[PDB]
Amino acid sequence: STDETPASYNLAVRRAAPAVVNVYNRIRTLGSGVIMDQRGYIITNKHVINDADQIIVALQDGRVFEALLVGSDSLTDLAVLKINATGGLPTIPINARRVPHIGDVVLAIGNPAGQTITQGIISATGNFLQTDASINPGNSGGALVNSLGELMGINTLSGIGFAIPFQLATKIMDKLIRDGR
Amino acid sequence: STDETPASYNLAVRRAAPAVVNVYNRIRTLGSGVIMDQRGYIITNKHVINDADQIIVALQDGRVFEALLVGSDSLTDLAVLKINATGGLPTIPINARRVPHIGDVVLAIGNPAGQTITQGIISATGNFLQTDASINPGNSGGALVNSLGELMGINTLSGIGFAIPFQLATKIMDKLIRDGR
Amino acid sequence: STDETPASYNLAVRRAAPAVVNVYNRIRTLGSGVIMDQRGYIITNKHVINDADQIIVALQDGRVFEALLVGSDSLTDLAVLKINATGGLPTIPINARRVPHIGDVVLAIGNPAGQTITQGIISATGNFLQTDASINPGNSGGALVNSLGELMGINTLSGIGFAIPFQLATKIMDKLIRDGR
Numbered sequence: 001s002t003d004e005t006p007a008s009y010n011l012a013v014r015r016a017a018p019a020v021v022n023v024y025n026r027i028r029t030l031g032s033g034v035i036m037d038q039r040g041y042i043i044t045n046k047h048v049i050n051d052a053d054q055i056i057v058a059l060q061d062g063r064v065f066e067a068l069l070v071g072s073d074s075l076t077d078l079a080v081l082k083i084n085a086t087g088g089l090p091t092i093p094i095n096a097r098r099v100p101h102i103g104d105v106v107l108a109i110g111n112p113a114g115q116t117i118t119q120g121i122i123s124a125t126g127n128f129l130q131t132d133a134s135i136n137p138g139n140s141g142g143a144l145v146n147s148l149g150e151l152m153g154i155n156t157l158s159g160i161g162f163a164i165p166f167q168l169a170t171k172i173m174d175k176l177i178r179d180g181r
Numbered sequence: 182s183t184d185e186t187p188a189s190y191n192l193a194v195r196r197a198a199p200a201v202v203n204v205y206n207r208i209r210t211l212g213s214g215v216i217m218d219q220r221g222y223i224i225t226n227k228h229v230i231n232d233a234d235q236i237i238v239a240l241q242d243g244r245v246f247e248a249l250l251v252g253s254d255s256l257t258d259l260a261v262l263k264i265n266a267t268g269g270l271p272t273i274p275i276n277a278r279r280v281p282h283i284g285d286v287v288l289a290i291g292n293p294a295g296q297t298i299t300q301g302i303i304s305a306t307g308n309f310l311q312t313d314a315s316i317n318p319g320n321s322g323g324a325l326v327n328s329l330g331e332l333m334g335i336n337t338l339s340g341i342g343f344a345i346p347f348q349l350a351t352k353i354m355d356k357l358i359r360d361g362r
Numbered sequence: 363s364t365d366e367t368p369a370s371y372n373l374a375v376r377r378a379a380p381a382v383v384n385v386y387n388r389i390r391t392l393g394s395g396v397i398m399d400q401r402g403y404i405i406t407n408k409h410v411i412n413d414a415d416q417i418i419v420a421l422q423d424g425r426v427f428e429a430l431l432v433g434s435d436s437l438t439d440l441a442v443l444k445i446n447a448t449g450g451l452p453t454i455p456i457n458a459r460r461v462p463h464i465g466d467v468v469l470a471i472g473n474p475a476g477q478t479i480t481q482g483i484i485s486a487t488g489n490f491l492q493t494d495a496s497i498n499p500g501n502s503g504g505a506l507v508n509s510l511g512e513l514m515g516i517n518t519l520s521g522i523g524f525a526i527p528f529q530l531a532t533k534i535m536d537k538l539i540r541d542g543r
Contacts, residue, residue, distance in 0.1 A: 103191035
């Protein structure tokens, strides 16, 4: 037993969990969020930031920034936030070439802090992406990733949970960065 | 990440999901079902077909047949249906030599349409077979299969779900084909 | 399909399930328990044994002993029991060198009898250890183990379940064996 290695998805956790953050109002805990790029853009659910006097974001490595709302799309309950990149921001691994398949193992990473991670599969490929991984306020707005750590979706609320396919989330983010809502 | 392959049970989905079908009344959605053989026999739960004026079955590939009730067993809540085989029916993979073991990974495949798939293990080998895979109306009457795609059980209703061991389901089906109920 | 082997965690079940036992009052079913050593010591939840006129323990191999309460810690809801070792007691595999990581696959083994086993991962490493494996009265007081079979925690009550890290459980047990509560 000692020589052999336990089955684990910790690899995906190490690669992806650093990029998932807390999101607060100023002090209340709103929900989770995901760092998408070095520029300092962050995706979260619209309902999380719907009534925020001031928005604060907290990484797992201890850093704490203030975020400004870039914009939101009601239809997808998504919202993009912006923060100053110190130089060295942890970003969510993304693979635009990866094709999500039904039955793929997925971890739902959320940060209501500690950090909570649940495991499931893709029930139905994205309409949105379905998974039997628990999706709750604690991980709403966080990332859904495969065993590799590659972003599959953004966890959203409202036995089956829902995430927004990463391809669509990318596109919505871009269009929100350029135009606004 | 791009070079490497995600952990997935999609293999089992491709092998088994084609054989799981919808079941309707004529238009209401009754539940799920499983194609067992080329002859055109289909297992579903008795409660699904309990009050059907007319029974319709819908495959994932787009075909739609009418089904006639062969018979049912109250004790197992099972029911066998019959449809004309076009020539080329997708059937549920079965291995009579395979011995289900506790801890075996299993996918519960149901078709309330899209098609919903959940993942778990065998908690207790069949009394019936137990699994922590979600078993709900959406997948009641559908198939439970291992990572290979081999039929383990027929999902049934009434944290733990229940499926009827494929060995018993086979036997009950045969006896219903010969005698009736 | 027949040549190939199903994905399974049955290995861990065979190695660990023998050591998980039933716990009764004398006849009511109280909960689950875990055999820790050849001496005949057994960990269970304090709430399970809180009001026991007489305590009985039942192994999976058919043997039935009476147990005496060594002591308990309210804070961890743990309780150590003692039974005469026949010679050949099945004990829960323990690895003091093993470091539990987030994302590790874990089976929650409980014995409300049959024996119920559920699967999940470590959401948060132990405060206590979190897992999305179902933790219910049926498996409260039982073992949580990895794919190897190595004890990770003692399942406890009160979408996320809780287990007491095996390192802490070991220490609490020792201190209860020496002093009492």
